[model samples]
Target: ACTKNAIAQTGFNKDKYFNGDVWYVTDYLDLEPDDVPKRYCAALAAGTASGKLKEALYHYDPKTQDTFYDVSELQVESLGKYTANFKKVDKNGNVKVAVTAGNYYTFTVMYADDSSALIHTCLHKGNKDLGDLYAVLNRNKDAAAGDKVKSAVSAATLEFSKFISTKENNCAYDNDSLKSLLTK
Candidate 1:
């Protein structure tokens, strides 16, 4: 009943999204032992929609010293059911809660059912928009590139700052290096 209500509220279906494909997840969100407040989930969903999802990665290089970057698009390694609980505060300050005894599904980012991909799990709710997923995907790519630019700019600024104040003995030649190099 809770799952049905979640579907009704969000109009998202994992089975429909994957077209009956299988999936996996190393970490599962279980709203048991401690119930996940609907407020928290709603806030998280809003942040995700605003392109604020977090990610962690571990990269290993072989003797070749070459690097390759890849992200795990949603894929399934196995299929199973789990418990899901949701709660929200009403206008009257009452807590409205729903707990699923069974039939909550999960998955991990995988290349194939047998091939595990090293990637972070994505945020999801029955109401998650597919466009939001794409936004996150692009945001990750842009963020990495932005970091590279930031690093380069910082290094260049430091180098320029050093050039403004230098010792007389610091130059390889007796003449001013900046003027000599600039003239060439």
Candidate 2:
């Protein structure tokens, strides 16, 4: 039931976005009511492998101390739209849960620049309920969301003030693991 046809950036530079670098979720907004926590941390590494787009993900709940790793192979839907099938894996890229139809997410790049990006995602894992999740990402985790990305959020008709900032969550990431997982 993942429902949200988010618009993508008008001229998304895919190469720049998947430049084999890590992007940290500085702020996030989940449209699902009462189903998520206020403080969450996530990071991702995107790059191309053997001519195929791939992404590695790291998600952490600062309050709950829950952490998870995933590797996804992205299939293009359009210039900035993709459908990714992800497999749960260990920090070292050892698969713990194999990829299936039920473990995919639709990703849209609402806006992206050299250091900041605004993206929308509809994650479908198993039989779970569907909801829209928007994230503001930055190359430097401590960097505040810039004007360009924040404007993009407004373009998406979302309130930036409602987004939960992960800056003060005592969050940390395993960047090495994410980079390695990009090829695994």
Candidate 3:
């Protein structure tokens, strides 16, 4: 598919379109899946922007077909009294170490070397159980329950995101600037 525009310009009123409300990073910094872990780095930005890093996003590989897009509807599951992160699968259909199955989540992609970073996220739409889980989980925590894990499955969502975002493993080159790589 061609690069999708966040907003499709139209006549008269200039109708607004946000490509739905959710997003997904198709591929990070053009690195082979296995190469990501080899180029690993550390966590750079965390809980500082207060949900305002959208403009900071740097599109990389605009000339390449690799790109991210907003998505609608994600698979969900229940984690007892709290909500859980949904299970997200890779292109190969293999599950990443992370678990994500909640609503109102933000997905960011980055390289461990701090070479690049970008965010593909979905906002909360008011799911009660999901809210309870998210409200208690701290994304910056290095320990369990601190990383948004009320249950193991949904925890995979955050784990998966971390797997792709952190230098610990799969040090992808998402570097935020890859967003520019999608030739418009």
Model 3 scores worst on lDDT over the 10 consecutive residues at: 12-21
How does candidate 3 fare on TM-score? 0.20
lDDT of each: 0.21, 0.90, 0.24
User: In lDDT terms, how accurate is model 1?
Assistant: 0.21
Question: How many angstroms is residue 97 displaced in model 2 relative to the true structure, after the best TM-score fit?
Answer: 0.3
Q: Rank candidates by TM-score, best first.
A: 2, 3, 1
lDDT of 3 at 172: 35
Give the top-scoring candidate (TM-score): 2
Collision pairs in model 1:
22-76, 23-76, 23-77, 24-107, 24-108
* Model 1 per-residue lDDT tens digits across residues 1-184: 1121111112323333232221121211222212321111000110011222111111212233322211112222333211222222222223333323221222222122111111112233455321111011111111222333223323322221221111211211111211111111
Candidate 3: where is the Cα deviation over 4 Å?
1-32, 39-41, 44-141, 146-152, 155-184
Q: How high is each candidate's TM-score?
A: 0.17, 0.96, 0.20
Prediction 2 TM-score vs. true: 0.96
Number of clashes in every candidate structure? 5, 0, 39
| Predicted structure with the largest lDDT when compared to the true one | 2
